[PDB]
Amino acid sequence: VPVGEELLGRVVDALGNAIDGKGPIGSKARRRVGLKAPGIIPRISVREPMQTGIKAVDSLVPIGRGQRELIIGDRQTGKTSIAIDTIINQKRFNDGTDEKKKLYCIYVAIGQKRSTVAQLVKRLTDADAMKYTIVVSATASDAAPLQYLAPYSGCSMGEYFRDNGKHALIIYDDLSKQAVAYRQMSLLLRRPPGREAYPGDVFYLHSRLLERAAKMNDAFGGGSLTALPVIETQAGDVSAYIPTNVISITDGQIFLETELFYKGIRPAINVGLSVS
Amino acid sequence: DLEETGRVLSIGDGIARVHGLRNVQAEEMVEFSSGLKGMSLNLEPDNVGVVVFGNDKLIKEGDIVKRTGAIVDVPVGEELLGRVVDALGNAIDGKGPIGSKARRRVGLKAPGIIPRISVREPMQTGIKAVDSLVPIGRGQRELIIGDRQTGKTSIAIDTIINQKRFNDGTDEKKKLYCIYVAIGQKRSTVAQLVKRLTDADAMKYTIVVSATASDAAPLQYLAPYSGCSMGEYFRDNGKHALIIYDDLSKQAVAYRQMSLLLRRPPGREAYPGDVFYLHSRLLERAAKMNDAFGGGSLTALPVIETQAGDVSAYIPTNVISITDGQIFLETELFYKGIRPAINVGLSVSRVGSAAQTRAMKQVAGTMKLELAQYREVAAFAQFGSDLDAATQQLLSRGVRLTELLKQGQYSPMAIEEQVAVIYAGVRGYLDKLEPSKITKFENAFLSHVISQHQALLSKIRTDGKISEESDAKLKEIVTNFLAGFEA
Amino acid sequence: GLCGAIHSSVAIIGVGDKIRSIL
Amino acid sequence: QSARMTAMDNASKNASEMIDKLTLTFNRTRQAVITKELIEIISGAA
Amino acid sequence: TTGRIVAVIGAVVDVQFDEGLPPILNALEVQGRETRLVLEVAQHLGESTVRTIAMDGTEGLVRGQKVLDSGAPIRIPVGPETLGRIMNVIGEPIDERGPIKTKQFAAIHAEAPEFVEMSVEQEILVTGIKVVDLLAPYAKGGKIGLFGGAGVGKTVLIMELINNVAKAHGGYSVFAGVGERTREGNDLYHEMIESGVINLKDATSKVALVYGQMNEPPGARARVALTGLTVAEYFRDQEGQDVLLFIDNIFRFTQAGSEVSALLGRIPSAVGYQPTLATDMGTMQERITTTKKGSITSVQAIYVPADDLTDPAPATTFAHLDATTVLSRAIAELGIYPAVDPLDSTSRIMDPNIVGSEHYDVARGVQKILQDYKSLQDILSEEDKLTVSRARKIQRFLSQPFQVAEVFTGHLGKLVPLKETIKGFQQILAGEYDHLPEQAFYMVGPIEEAVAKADKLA
Amino acid sequence: TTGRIVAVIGAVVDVQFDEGLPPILNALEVQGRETRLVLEVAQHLGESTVRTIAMDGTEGLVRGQKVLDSGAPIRIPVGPETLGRIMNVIGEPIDERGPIKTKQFAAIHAEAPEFVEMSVEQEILVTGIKVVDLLAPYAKGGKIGLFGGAGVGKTVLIMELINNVAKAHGGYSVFAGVGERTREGNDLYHEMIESGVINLKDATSKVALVYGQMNEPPGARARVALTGLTVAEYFRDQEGQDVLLFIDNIFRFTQAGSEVSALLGRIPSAVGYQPTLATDMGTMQERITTTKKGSITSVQAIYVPADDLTDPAPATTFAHLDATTVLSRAIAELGIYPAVDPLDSTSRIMDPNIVGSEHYDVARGVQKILQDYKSLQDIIAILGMDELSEEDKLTVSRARKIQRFLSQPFQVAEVFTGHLGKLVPLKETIKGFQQILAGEYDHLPEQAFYMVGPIEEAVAKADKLAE
Amino acid sequence: VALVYGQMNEPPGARARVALTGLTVAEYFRDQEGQDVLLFIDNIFRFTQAGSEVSALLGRIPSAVGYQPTLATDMGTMQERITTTKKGSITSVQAIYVPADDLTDPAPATTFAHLDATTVLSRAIAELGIYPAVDPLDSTSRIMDPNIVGSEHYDVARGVQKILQDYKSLQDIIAILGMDELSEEDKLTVSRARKIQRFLSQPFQVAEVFTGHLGKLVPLKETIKGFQQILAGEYDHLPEQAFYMVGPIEEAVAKADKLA
Amino acid sequence: ATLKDITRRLKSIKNIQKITKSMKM
Q1: I need a surface site. Which of A80, E131, F162, G87 has the fewest CB within 10 A?
Q2: In this complex, how many residue pairs, one in chain B and one in chain H, have their CB atoms less than 8 Å apart?
Q3: Which listed residue (B120, B165, B268, B350) is catalytic?
Q4: Which of B356, B371, B404 is a domain's end point?
Q5: Which ranges in B378-467 belong to alpha helices (H)?
Q6: Looking at the structure, do residues B195 and B287 belong to the same domain, yes or no?
Q7: Which fold has domain G144-260?
Q8: Which residues carry this modification: N6-succinyllysine (chain D)?
Q9: What domain range includes position A46?
Q10: CB-CB: which of A41, A191, A272 is closest to F96?
């Protein structure tokens, strides 16, 4: 896929093709989508704050640069909104001249409807946040392979910043829909189903993606890629198969609940069940 | 030659598909070129599905497979007593060869309707709750069932340990040879187990048959049957044997592995349609023989592990239905202090009174009725400060008898010692004693009567009941002992 | 408690522990 | 004392109806779990 | 014709035939084996090969072993000579008394009676037992679900039923042990000998025994109910009798069917049951009915898996039941025998139209007064005190000494005619015996003995 | 002997050999790869074709690609030169420190010690962790399992155990990272350098590291535990000294087997698992053990999918352990750390004849009071506290204090608790719970008992909570 | 109005494609006429169910609950055509059947994300007599936003939902012990929530045979005002049944006056 | 929702039913 700062402010598809009507994407660099995560050595402990600007998150379940932090909950509990407030939050740093404090953002939409992604982009443009944001979109009418691919492609765009002494944030909205697209492909390739008809290696699908979010030591540039994957639960069951699969990958989770939401607890964060 | 020999077509996951062997019998044991054995479970038009007795790394495509006239049998006799063997009767205790003079097929049919007689001789566990409320007779099959770590093996071990008093005696009807079958357990657990039996001087009349976690599935599958045939030696020679299958859940798992890998059709929980048949063939071989056939017996205590108390899962359901009764163990009773953790209300013995001595029968009935009446009222034992005296008495007798059913491990009790404690609660001598003190009271009381009133305990044994004289003496001892203890 | 609307209907002394805990 | 007698009679009735309702939910779930597991096994085998 | 074994996989055996193939359900006889091995045809696989289910163990079988087509389904001895004997699923004696010397044999697979053969006549099969006859009566050709585990006097009830039906009506009984525990099969046999319902010295036996023991393959346990049915069908269709058929256990009939279906590779249905659950049940149950010739009435001991009455097995069975007998531990511990719960046991023929108007009213009166007694247990006035003492005397008059428990107790067992039962409970409801003591009604037969028990003990 | 790749589907590779067919378990070397790619023989399919599991990614493989039989299973470096180093599944160094300076090697597949080789010795291993020491103590040379659902505290606990037990250990330790986070591997590696348990300049390193994390394909994750334990087996048998073996997380071995099971042509068993789950586990677990030759104290973190302890993977693991520490999300959710379920954690040595009557009585007393409270909670949630008898509400208040006194600040958890870590001697653990049970602190507030070390801190906290 | 029909008498191929036929008709009016279009579909679940029937006949390996492995993509390719564009407006209203009342069933569960507003009906609510049987705590809209509907609208809506949620998470205790055991504070929230529940019911012009009442249509400003007044406690004295099956709040006042 | 959860609730409401009845009496 196309890779670099030329993608900033642009809405692209799963292969980096411009879908925003603004003209062809012209980067000087390209990058493979299926590269393995850095091992033990290229890494150093997460120690730099990735500020969301959300009191409950920053104080109770803090996110650092290079961390993976899941956003999880039922439909309409406020999951996307956490990611959006986080992207908008970076303007304070990005307007400055200190490159080590900046955070470049990538929003990957998987399986969403195009109008929702468009409203998302309008919001990020009005807040003057699009200028440092790449939107990668594989929507509901895109073929299953494109939806399966989109997270990895977005990840490759983010790994550009990571490997060049810069800091990027990536949102996967959402991994539930990616798992569904992958399940289809796998069943139709006649690979026999496992639990809940998902393929035997549905864990590995998400674990290889999320491991690529990492904090690099100074030898490798000191850069980072922070991931906020999104999982949709059904009836608020955080303890379900696929949810616990992804909880068991990430470096924590922000758990949102409808009960709390309507009680006036917004953001609807369950403190005891959330961790960093 | 393709009649008496074959060649491996494919090998994987303990299953060898073999071309030829046209003359093999269903369930025949054949030999690989590596020396490993296999059992011919699937006879198909173009191949034999052979289940491997070991590691498949020594079996390759094109390997020669031979019929050897092999008979699936095990050593049998009094020479196995004190020994630890594998599923096939080979010594694994490092004490040299089994000096076996006789052998017996592991796969044999159970005695039919006719050669049997009603179960009527007590099989004493030495555990008060069992001997009184879930009594076992010789020839019976009594399930021990419960979740992990509920005390299942302990019941079996204490029962084995209990037989020492009979086996050291001179009565040529009371003895009882023991067989403990370990299926799918870890080797160190079995080592701890045999240490326990050795220290208790129980190994001398016990055979341990063990097919552990790293043993190939067919070995774990066979082990119970192999042990059964060893017990059947005693049964068929006018003697009495006790077999423990610890546990049949793990045996079923091993059989399921084989069935699925042989591509037999899966059912509920992926078990095959013959999984009931697996356990029913095994457990029907426990029997009490009539005098015409020697009068011998084999008693079985199968063990089933449930998951989160689900006694209605597939394998529990099967073995519950097969057996003559069940001892149900529960986690919340265990941690409440009810140890052994027997649910008295749910546990049953269909042989019942027929398996009890007169001394036990004179107290077990009263206890059963009073606990049943207590169970109706027990929910509001802590929510009835103003309820009437009649239901207050049911509750008061209630958790007193319950405390008397509690018992420590590794000291199974003689029947006369059991009834002397059960009588004390039943005839009302502890109704004024604080609940929490009863377990420590009984320990002190029992030590006191064993040491000082052996003449009294003998009278309950020699006369086979508690007389008026015995009743008067027990009243004096209990009441005066109670006052000293509660201080 | 557990007597329906006995305490609530009647609700500085008050006879009954429910009276003072409610008021 | 009359009001407590009354309220507890009704509570015990409400508890009864809830026991029935919950036992029915339990057993539908019990059956559904078994059926679902079997359908996953069959699908994998086919 | 003679076929050859081409496959053996557990209790499933495939056989190839050179000429005409044996139809599905035909019994095949395996050649060259010590005891008798029957294979029942289940499928035509194509290429001249049939798939069969084995009736005994299949160990030692060789591919190419000769197999003989019998020309018919499993055929078993039928006639008076089955009475007092124990046979297996394929009709072999298993009591070591020699051949069962009948002058007829019959196929165990037989179609249920046709529509035109149906009787619309609804008739009570009088058992002579007060609890049953009054409150939950048996219907000729009907099916009765027998509930309760052990220790509630199940076998004694069964033996008394056999004794009473033969004594009152002149009809014989058939006991089919489906998944019989071999130990309990031995116990039942010797208990029947002691009670006199089986006589080993003459031809007066009242029951024929058919055992399908637990250690037998799925095929055997699945078909043994049919074998028992076939023995019963002779007494109905050839001797015009009102026959009793006991099936112990109906769930184990279902279970064995599920196992057979599994072994044949058929995809399981809901909860793991065979897809043929309802037809397996229907083709068997529909043979139990009233016809022009007579009737087979069946008492079927019911196991309810997971205590779930909505489980497919009991739910499917319940569709065929006309009555229930609920044996209760609570009723047993009160000393009332038979230990039949008088409120839980029900019958579809408890109707003012089927049974008499006099029958319905008294039984409804007994039900009401027992429920009202339970209502007054929580808490009396002169009317309430009258209803309490009446009901307690009714509780006792429901108890009965059995003829089968005569040598064990010494107490004379009683068979009480229907009208004697109705008028007995009628005279208590009217308060005609509230002048007399209470415990004079415990463990007696006809009401005339309860009066005499008050006349003697006054 | 030389084969050709004939099929590639994910981690599963089929290889045809015209001549010498390699036996099951053999390691095969793919030619024409930049980095070494090992295939392990799993099956003989027939037609001179073997089915194999790859130890690294299969991207770039071509039908026709040549494959060499090494003539043996995967062989890895063992011995003292593994200490202070990091190795992968196939024995390669992954610490950028050059070659493993050794020439003694061992196959990762081996037979389990026989029944005759078993030791029955079992003595207490004090952890300084109140809940563990009181209720379900560990034994030296025993098998310890730490069960838990996702994010309940398995790793924090294993790290605390490494801190409390391994830092003052008289022998060698092996840590096996099996299917976990690479970030945790980096954390641990640099922590042990900072503590000196690993030394990069001299030969004083005490710990050997083996890793195959969740970034690796299933073949790697299926086999890294065998690699890790092979290193342990050498230190046990060829030396005779005591070994500590830590595994995080052993579930990942079973999960990896389930990932490839359908592609190996297996009909699934219950809950989507391989039919071989239990024998697979048995052949691996039965090697993880103390023998008459030497001691292994093994501590294995055990993942519980969907928090369901009846899941075939954890359910099958229980029987392989001597002590079980079961963690619960229901408890973690309350801020009770470590999140140990006191009513679902067990130990072989919780026996009055081993730990003494005092220890045993207090442990059973604690469990009883907690089970009594658990049974009451739901009744009092609806009918109210005021309905309880004085005896019941005394057991409630004491139980809630006991629940809190089981919580404890860990040194390795300071970044999570905001409290300094604490280690509590067994003597003090017994005394503390004894006194609460005896009603000696009935007058103290509930919260005084939360998140402290010894009972003296609860008293001090109660005084501080006044003003 | 243009009508397109493929009903439950049709084989599955027809039922799977007929929604596309309807869409195509609407697409023309949206694009080649650039005009405001209304599209009504009853019932879109039937599209997915029909797909399940054909998938079984196509021999696909089935997905969860026996559904086609292509459930989501098939739905996406169809739903993404049901949309407003810069070229023209489609206001679409799709009735969505819920198998065995299970909202987690893959069919309805996958449909949610294709919608801007959702009205979720509840059998429990219908059985209580509240029509329309809308679940007020499970029905959502993208325009429920203070910057869109104004702070007054937003505040009253969230205030109504708070009191309803507070009533909901007392259901456990109420079902056992009744309302009389609750604190005065909780009793107040229960009484108002029950009045709000009833004021959310409304006679429909279309359902006059079933309600027995003339249908009512309420202006937005009147809806806001009515629930605002209830939340403020202005009608705490009025009986609950007064708020049942009315239009504007004045009808609830008049109804209470006739009662007492 | 899940069998374990319902199991606990069922044991709870069964105890309440009994207590409420005794309290009525």
Answers
A1: G87
A2: 15
A3: B350
A4: B356
A5: 389-403, 415-426, 438-452, 454-462
A6: yes
A7: 1.10.1140
A8: 21
A9: 1-276
A10: A41
